[PDB]
């Protein structure tokens, strides 16, 4: 990654064994549960495109997901080349060239070019652009690996309300690949009869905390 | 490896116990599955030829593979010597065995790697090593892409996982990989999935296929 050293200068640093292993292990243990995306984002803080590719390439399984991700990346790179085309032509000695999509994805750019772009003033943030593409693809993977539809989350006859809400928002998060009226309608609608009666008595605009207190 | 200090100089730093153990353990656990090669490349960031030899030499098993790797390295060194033949306080020029770290000292490696302009002998050697490792990975692939057929009850996702794991290990050219995707992937899905996919028609993305057969 590119980090500030102890005297305030932006320098390249090798990706660490701790980071490499942390990413490999989270993929092995959690597959594509939604919380893997924030973990990815945190583990790739300051990453160059080379670092991002290292992280993706060290994954051993899930090669279907990796192929989907590769396709999402190529689509975003094509859109980059359409909306931010690079004037073709000569090379300027000692001068920074502009990245095309395959440069941002680290396929046609050197590490030294990536460092040059990321530490320029102003910075050309090829690492963050690539990371946006990667997270787009990963969210598509999370949505596809979601096992259950929110419509199938209904409170069990004896199920504590807290456990039902846990399943409800776990499912919603996986299905949207994000934690952010139809949904609350649905939460009350699929609560069990007793709880549903209590919740409807609370009326509109009640908070989740008030609902959970009311059905405890 | 070679790292940058606060004075902007590129200087040697000892290979770490964490790096040493991480590489030993990945070889023990994954053998020569394809993802071993990117890990090798990441763990050897900034490596001198001495560091690369340390990583290779600390492997205990797989001595057939390690001897094949030596063969590949020596072939690449001979080619280097063919293309860059060599003739007092001055920097001599590296021969093939100098880049591979058997006839060069650490201080010579540092001198080449930190010179202006640099002779990046660590990166050259790493390239040769990855060439040999690629040959090993392909040889140790347990399965051919032609034998990957979706089971009558196998979820489509698991079939695609197997398909592209095999393709990755086999390491064909991109045109042949594309041919495999356009010909074999749908061709070897099970009857129901194959019907749905063919109904989707060509140009469908892998995402669309996988959603359709879920």
């Amino acid at each position: 990654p590119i980090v500030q050293n102890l005297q305030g200068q932006m320098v390249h640093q090798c990706i660490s064994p701790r980071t490499l292993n942390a990413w490999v292990k989270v993929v092995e243990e959690k597959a594509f549960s939604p919380e893997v995306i924030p973990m990815f984002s945190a583990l790739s803080c300051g990453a160059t495109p080379q670092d991002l590719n290292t992280m993706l390439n060290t994954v051993g399984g899930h090669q279907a997901a990796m192929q989907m991700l590769k396709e999402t990346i190529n689509e975003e790179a094509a859109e980059w080349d359409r909306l931010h085309p690079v004037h073709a032509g000569p090379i300027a000695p000692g001068q920074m060239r502009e990245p095309r999509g395959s440069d941002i994805a680290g396929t046609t750019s050197t590490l030294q070019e990536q460092i040059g772009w990321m530490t320029h003033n102003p910075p050309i943030p090829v690492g963050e652009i690539y990371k946006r593409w990667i997270i787009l693809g990963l969210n598509k993977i999370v949505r596809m690996y979601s096992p259950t539809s929110i419509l199938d989350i209904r409170q069990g006859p004896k199920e504590p309300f807290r456990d039902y809400v846990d399943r409800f928002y776990k499912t919603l998060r996986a299905e949207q690949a994000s934690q952010e009226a139809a949904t609350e309608t649905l939460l009350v609608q699929n609560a069990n009869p007793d709880c549903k009666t209590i919740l409807k008595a609370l009326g509109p605009g009640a908070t989740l905390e008030e609902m959970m207190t009311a059905c405890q | 490896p070679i790292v940058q200090n606060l004075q902007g100089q590129m200087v040697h730093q000892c290979i770490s116990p964490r790096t040493l153990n991480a590489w030993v353990k990945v070889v023990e656990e994954k053998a020569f599955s394809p993802e071993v090669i990117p890990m090798f490349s990441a763990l050897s960031c900034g490596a001198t030829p001495q560091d690369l030899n340390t990583m290779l030499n600390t492997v205990g098993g797989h001595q057939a593979a390690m001897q094949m790797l030596k063969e590949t390295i020596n072939e690449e060194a001979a080619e280097w010597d063919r293309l860059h033949p060599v003739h007092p306080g001055q920097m001599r020029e590296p021969r093939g065995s100098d880049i591979a770290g058997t006839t060069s000292t650490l201080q010579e490696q540092i001198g080449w790697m930190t010179h202006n302009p640099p002779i990046p002998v660590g990166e050259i050697y790493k390239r040769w090593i990855i060439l040999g490792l690629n040959k090993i990975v392909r040889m140790y692939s347990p399965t051919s892409i032609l034998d990957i057929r979706q089971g009558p009850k196998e979820p489509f996702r698991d079939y695609v996982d197997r398909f592209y794991k095999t393709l990755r290990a086999e390491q064909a050219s991109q045109e042949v990989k594309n041919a495999a995707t356009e010909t074999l992937l749908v061709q070897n899905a099970n009857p129901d999935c194959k019907t749905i996919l063919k109904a989707l028609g060509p140009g469908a993305t892998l995402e669309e296929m996988m959603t359709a057969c879920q």
């Binding site: 990796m66 | 390491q171 990989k177």
Partner: peptide
């Protein structure tokens, strides 16, 4: 000659 295993980059 094998094409390598770096799917990305």
């Amino acid at each position: 000659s094998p094409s390598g295993v770096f799917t990305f980059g």
